Amino acid sequence: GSTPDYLMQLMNDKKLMSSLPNFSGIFNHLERLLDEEISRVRKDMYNDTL
C-alpha cells in the first residue's frame, strides 16, 4: 500500500527547479539527483503492486 504524498512533494520540487533554470545551471548534479529519486519512487510504488 503506497503513499503518493512523497511523490507529490518531489514533483513539486521538480516543478520548482524547472522554473529556475539559472539556479539549476550552477549545480553539477542537483536536478539529476531529484529526477533519479522521482524515478526510483515511481518504480517502488508500482513494484509494491506486483
Write out the residues near a second copy by the rule CB under 8 A: 9-10, 12-13, 16-17, 23, 26-30, 33-34, 37
Our CB check for a second copy shows the closer of 1 and 25 to be 25
Are 3 and 44 in contact, with CB atoms under 8 Å apart? no
Distances (CA, A) of 41 to 23, 24, 26, 45: 24, 22, 26, 6
Our CB check for a second copy shows the closer of 2 and 10 to be 10
For residue 6, the minimal CB distance to a second copy (Å) is 8
- Judged by the rule CB under 5 A, the positions of this chain that interact with Ca ion are 31
